[model samples]
Target: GSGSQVQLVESGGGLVQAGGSLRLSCAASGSTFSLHLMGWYRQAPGKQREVVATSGSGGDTNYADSVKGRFTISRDNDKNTVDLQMNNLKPEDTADYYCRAQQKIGRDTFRDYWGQGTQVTVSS
Candidate 1:
């Protein structure tokens, strides 16, 4: 349970084959959306969740070098929509996913406000 209530929206099973592009979306609700950075966590099968990357609404994305060019994040202020994009998908990409943001109380103070996690199945 986080400060802000976030509604994670997904595009029902778009079938992302290996070496393909994947697009997912989320929307913010029940809270003021500002000064928050988005987080991407990926959990494969029965494995523990892992941080794939983090990015701000309009800030640069930070991804593991091993997956840097493969992941991208962006937000739409007008629609309160946040999008996660991945290219060149791999089998390991199949996992339950979640997005989170930092709730800023000051210029440099914030905590993670997670959204309801989403289940992602990346397969051919």
Candidate 2:
């Protein structure tokens, strides 16, 4: 479980509205002790996904304040469980949401390098 990876189950394709709220769960399975950190991302159309934050099980979180309040991420590091919540959702907030690990480094930064992305479409 340390070296290998697993997929967390949650919703993918859906629709929401501006000012609405949405929540999704990412349930990880593995030995998080060996895992380094957790992160979230969002993708728009054909553009690359952007990292939102990198956090640890002990509630050590770092994120851009501009967007942090609109979104919340939490996890039980020991249990390999994580949850995501987005509030006051605007139509532009629509897209694919991914939960990934910063446990390993490659080119330079921690990436949601591999993800089972969930596409969230915002509509009126």
Candidate 3:
């Protein structure tokens, strides 16, 4: 089965000031926590989705060039949750954050699930 009740729920979106930081949480269900990998991305106003990073149970996070070294992603298998943490927020960081789930097919993987958009704004 492609998706046996797979789902993602994200939180911690709102207003944040520049120079501050934020932490977002996403909960996964419908299968084993490690069965599908968890990741993150964002969409700016009238723009395509920007890929941020992806992480498994406890391995390294494969971050995109735009977010490399500036973002952090982790998964808590015990809680079936994934979290994204970013520091020193900037005004240009405002966007709609989305939690993503990756499904693996043999040796390949692709995004198969996503969370409802979480609106966040960075203010001065």
Candidate 4:
């Protein structure tokens, strides 16, 4: 699906240290930005993906338990941009982070698109 219109680019990744923050951003192209849910997640090597946050159409954001109260996600419709900021990084935070395009068909959510996940390693 190289010609797919829905494309996402995620940035702001690199080595980070504990006691600091990890800030990531995603820019979307095509008409799906506001039409679907935009989210962030991470996965360790050979591990299952973990949802960090998902920002809905109305600025309502849902965060996983581990990130609640500490991680935040937001989007700018005009700019077609989504951002994620998480504080208090830890060594276990080393993983590849991805920006996802999720579609809700009825009550079920489906992730149909994703960015080339960026790997971030938190210094021990």
Among these predictions, the greatest lDDT belongs to 4
Best by TM-score: 4
Q: In candidate 4, residue 122 scores what lDDT?
A: 88
Q: Which digits, one per residue and each the tens of the lDDT, describe model 2 over residues 1-124?
A: 3444544555544777878788766666644444556777777676687776667746688765756787787867556466677777777777788777655454564534345778887786
* Clash number for candidate 2: 0
Q: Compose the digit string of candidate 3's lDDT tens values, residues 93-118.
A: 89999988776755664557888979
| Candidate 1 residue spans exceeding 4 A from truth | 1-14, 33-35, 106-109
Taking the tens digit of each residue's C-alpha lDDT, what string does model 1 give over 4-57? 454544433455677777776666665555646776777667777778777765
Residue 2, model 4: lDDT of 55
**Model 1: how far residue 24 lies from native, Å:** 1.1
Alpha carbon deviation, residue 33, candidate 2 (Å):
4.4
Each candidate structure's TM-score, on Cα atoms with residue i matched to residue i, is 0.74, 0.73, 0.81, 0.83
Q: Candidate 2 versus the native: TM-score?
A: 0.73
Comparing 1 and 4 on TM-score, the stronger one? 4
What's the lDDT for all of these models? 0.67, 0.66, 0.79, 0.80
- Model 4, range 1-124, lDDT digits (tens) per residue? 3545667889977888987798898877766335467889998776799888987867678899988878899887646478888788888878889998765555675557788899888898
Model 3: per-residue Cα lDDT at residue 53: 87
Ranking of candidates on lDDT, top first: 4, 3, 1, 2
Worst 10 residues of 4 by lDDT: 102-111
